[PDB]
Design a protein around this ligand. Sequence first.
Ligand SMILES: CN(C)C[C@H](O)CN1CCN(c2cc(C(F)(F)F)cc(C(F)(F)F)c2OC(=O)N(C)c2ccc(F)cc2)C1=O
Ligand SMILES: Nc1nc2c(ncn2[C@H]2CC[C@@H](COP(=O)(O)OP(=O)(O)OP(=O)(O)O)O2)c(=O)[nH]1
Ligand SMILES: [Mg+2]
Length: 634
Amino acid sequence: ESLSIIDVASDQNLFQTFIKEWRCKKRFSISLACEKIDTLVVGLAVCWGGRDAYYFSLGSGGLDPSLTLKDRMWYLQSCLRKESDKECSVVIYDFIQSYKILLLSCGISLEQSYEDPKVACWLLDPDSQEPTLHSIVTSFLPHELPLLEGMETSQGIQSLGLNAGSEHSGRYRASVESILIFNSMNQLNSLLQKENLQDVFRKVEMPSQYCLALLELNGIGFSTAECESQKHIMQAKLDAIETQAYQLAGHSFSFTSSDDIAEVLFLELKLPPGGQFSTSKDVLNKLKALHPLPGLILEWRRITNAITKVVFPLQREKCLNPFLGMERIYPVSQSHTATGRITFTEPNIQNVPRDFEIKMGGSGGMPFSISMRHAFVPFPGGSILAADYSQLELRILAHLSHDRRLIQVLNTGADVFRSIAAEWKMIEPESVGDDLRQQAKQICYGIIYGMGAKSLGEQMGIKENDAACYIDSFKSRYTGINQFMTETVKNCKRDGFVQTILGRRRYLPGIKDNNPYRKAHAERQAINTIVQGSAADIVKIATVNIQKQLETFHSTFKSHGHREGMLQSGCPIRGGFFILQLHDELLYEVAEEDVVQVAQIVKNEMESAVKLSVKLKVKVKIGASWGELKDFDV
DNA sequence: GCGAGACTCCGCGCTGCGACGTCG
DNA sequence: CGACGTCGCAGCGC
Ligand SMILES: CN(C)C[C@H](O)CN1CCN(c2cc(C(F)(F)F)cc(C(F)(F)F)c2OC(=O)N(C)c2ccc(F)cc2)C1=O
Ligand SMILES: Nc1nc2c(ncn2[C@H]2CC[C@@H](COP(=O)(O)OP(=O)(O)OP(=O)(O)O)O2)c(=O)[nH]1
Ligand SMILES: [Mg+2]
């Protein structure tokens, strides 16, 4: 009763006994064995109980030649795909990557109900460290840790069998993993039921992982010439900014040096020094009204960020898609977050700057709009669809607090953020530009989620006591919100956690800390996690339900990764392809024929993802790029 | 294995560059 | 003195 690896493809009789038993199993685990040569799948291990790992070789030599590779590929797809009336669950460590490797390297599209123990670990504690196979075995199967004691890829985030960079055979890594993750996932399912989170796991979180796998196979379209065009414009503005700045300072300085900037502004120019000599964005936002140089430093930092942190990473990661005839970006989704919202890495498409303006040329300069999102384009002939939850966290705060004033501002009032800048600056709400509106937006959510008066004063260019009047006024105006905050802190001090709309718990032991810094931090986390975490739940429910509806149409492809395998073994592009998620907004790449059908499916499924005491307002915008979106009435 | 400090008081998140160190 | 290295910040996003 140790690791028994059964090489099922070594004897044709043993293989048909294996296929027979496999087709009876309602639950099993698989672990892809991948080696270098490379995304070479040399086989997979299946486990449906105990310490038996049935290794299905997809390569060798000791295999029965009567089992051709194409024969073995037929049985592999037959056992990994459903008949749509039989419920069958597959346990897969790192399901997203395995799903993509199976499709792209083996031509097999998984068609069952999936369970990733990594996702289960996050669901039970969202602040836990990102799980590794070692951590899951250390936690749940500590007796089995010797099996991995030799394995050193175990403490990595990547699946054991998927880690081709290992001196161990893929057969042994996959076999070990299949047994460990099968029994671990059984423990994790008992914990999910104990916490009443298994329906969230099976109906929301795992299907959410399925949608992100389609997104990662799709990628997002990217125009290299559009991005290169903006870099030249920006770099010319940067050269002019540096020239004008050095004339104002009377000498050359380093924009990247906080000391040179502090010396010029305060030591030389004698600008109000404000514990001081700080070159922060808050300090320069106030000083830019007195002298032009602070504003030039802010513009220099904005453009340098766009060039060094956006332009070059995007052109670094662009890949050619020969089937669509375009370049695309393929980011990696990340769902192990504190509040359950999805982010992206390599590169982080969510960080693409909003549109900004640069004046160039003589005589005050003519305006030019830098829209880096305009570089993200659909496939030739398609459109980008952008449906957005209007004021999601504010409507969730209204549903949970029943604050009649907030509900009134949402249903009838004008834009809150523009009205905040108006009362702040004593100006018209229409005169508020996007930069000022963004300042008022952070002021809004900052005050709501517990910002102090010292920081609010540094953000508003006023002193701490005048900012305290703004905070005190908000509490006076919005007592329903303030009582929801008092009640949330109280219930978190009693329970040790807070809950989202779906029941997910975030544990905040600092709520009972005596140090006032740690206590207040947990108190603000408690209020924010409930709202932001519930917003993340709703967007996930909508993403899953939209994908379920798009696949009811036979013309639809699951992803570009699927269709480009069906072109390799006469497919006009159809349907909408999930390309990006923006915390309260979903982007889709849709064919022109189905631009209206997908737009109606997206809006209706978003507006009815959950039922709240406040309606979920959704606005759909379609355009020829992420940056050139126009309203679409749907 | 404990929990200094006076350091830390909107929340969530990713990453290229700069500041200070190191090998040679 | 230079190349290469490492960790955290401060820039941007929601
Ligand atoms: C609808 N009526 C006609 C009322 C009319 O709009 C009056 N205003 C204007 C803004 N505003 C408001 C609204 C909300 C939200 F709707 F989201 F609940 C939140 C804040 C918050 F959080 F920023 F304080 C708000 O700002 C404030 O209340 N103050 C005191 C404030 C103003 C400016 C500033 F720079 C800092 C604070 C509000 O009620
Ligand atoms: N705590 C906090 N949450 C923020 C902040 N900025 C954004 N968020 C969260 C709450 C709202 C959510 C989405 O914000 P967006 O800016 O995309 O949307 P919005 O705030 O409703 O404005 P708009 O409709 O103009 O996009 O992200 C911030 O500064 N602090
Ligand atoms: Mg929004």
